Design a protein around this ligand. Structure first.
Ligand SMILES: O[C@@H]1[C@@H](O)[C@H](O[C@@H]2CO[C@@H](O)[C@H](O)[C@H]2O)OC[C@H]1O
Ligand SMILES: O[C@@H]1[C@@H](O)[C@H](O[C@@H]2CO[C@H](O)[C@H](O)[C@H]2O)OC[C@H]1O
Ligand code: NAG
Length: 319
């Protein structure tokens, strides 16, 4: 009947979509987001980030995040919660602080404890740390890495695990979906967390790909298995496949085969629990404002109509 029913038929936990609060006032959008044939899981695109949830130190703000959880709860959808420690979308107080290891650690831990406890029981997974790596596999020079060092990553995991012992704790990153230094470094982050003694349950593969330059099914699968071999689960967390504009029939067909291979890679890897697309309609994609000249990244167009990519995903799911 749809992407999520097809996904569950193959043993995945869900097919899902990100969303954001301004889109929840569009009744046609909400109708399809709420179609559980297609979406069994929701991620908030913005309202669980640090700037949204802790705009001032120890001053938490949950209304916008809770509005997304309320929509998922209405529909019986699972939630992925996104994201606790990330260098982007930080409030001014974090980025402008004069910190010591001890003072920034205390602020970070308090952020994690508060936000994870707030959403205790409500999340399938958290993206505990996002985007910790450079492309060469070195650590990104975020405030957290500059002040705390590598230990910030396992400390974050351990803090989240104390606050909610049942939720799956993920490390989430982009360009870790294909073989290379960054993916190896992400495997090493799993290993480092466990060597510290902290819990990590999953690796989140963003999957922000480009039409005609998408990793192949074989390389996707080799990489997924490289993480599941470590005793963690995997998911594609932010899938979109942006095209160089303008859209054409040929590019739409190529985008279908690109999405097809991602779904098929996940089915072929035991331990791949699901796929989340980063929103579901081109109308609301983040892409065009960030990647100049690119767009039309999703399985529905800006008029809420299925594109050939929808059929590619169904075909990759074996439906
Ligand atoms: O609305 C936008 C969001 O869709 C966007 O989300 C980020 C996209 O890049 C991924 O790497 C991040 O993990 C994800 O949160 O953030 C910017 C915002 O304007
Ligand atoms: O906020 C960041 C973006 O800067 C980032 O961009 C990558 C760069 O390498 C690629 O071409 C990949 O397709 C892009 O998505 O993307 C993720 C986002 O976190
Ligand atoms: C910060 O302190 C923790 C001990 O609380 C430690 O694990 C970490 O390595 C320290 N980092 C730096 C740069 O001192």
């Amino acid at each position: 009947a749809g992407l999520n029913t097809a996904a569950k038929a193959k043993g995945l936990k869900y097919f899902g979509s990100a969303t954001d609060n301004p889109e929840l006032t569009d009744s046609a959008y909400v109708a399809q987001l709420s179609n559980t044939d297609d979406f069994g899981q929701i991620t908030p695109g913005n309202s669980m980030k640090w700037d949204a949830t802790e705009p001032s130190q120890n001053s938490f703000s949950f209304a916008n995040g809770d509005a997304v959880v309320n929509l998922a709860n209405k529909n019986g959808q699972l939630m992925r919660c996104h994201t606790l420690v990330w260098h982007s979308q930080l409030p001014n107080w974090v980025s402008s602080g004069s910190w010591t290891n001890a003072t920034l650690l205390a602020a970070m831990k308090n952020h994690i404890t508060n936000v994870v406890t707030h959403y205790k029981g409500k999340c399938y997974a958290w993206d505990v740390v996002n985007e910790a790596l450079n492309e060469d596999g070195t650590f990104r020079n975020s405030v957290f890495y500059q002040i705390i060092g590598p230990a910030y990553i396992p400390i974050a995991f351990a803090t989240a695990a104390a606050a909610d012992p049942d939720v799956k704790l993920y490390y989430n990153d982009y360009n870790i979906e294909y073989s290379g230094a960054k993916a190896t470094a992400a495997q090493n982050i799993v290993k480092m967390i466990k060597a510290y003694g902290a819990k990590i349950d999953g690796v989140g593969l963003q999957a922000h790909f480009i039409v005609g330059s998408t990793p192949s099914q074989s390389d996707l699968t080799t990489v997924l298995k490289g993480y599941t071999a470590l005793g963690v689960e995997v998911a594609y967390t932010e899938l979109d496949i942006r095209m160089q504009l303008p859209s054409t029939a040929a590019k739409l067909a190529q985008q279908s085969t690109d999405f097809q291979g991602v779904a098929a890679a996940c089915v072929s890897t035991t331990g791949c629990v699901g796929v989340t697309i980063w929103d579901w309609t081109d109308k609301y994609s983040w892409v065009p404002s960030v990647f100049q000249g690119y767009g039309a990244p999703l399985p529905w167009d800006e008029n809420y109509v299925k594109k050939p990519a929808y059929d590619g995903l169904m075909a990759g799911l074996g439906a």
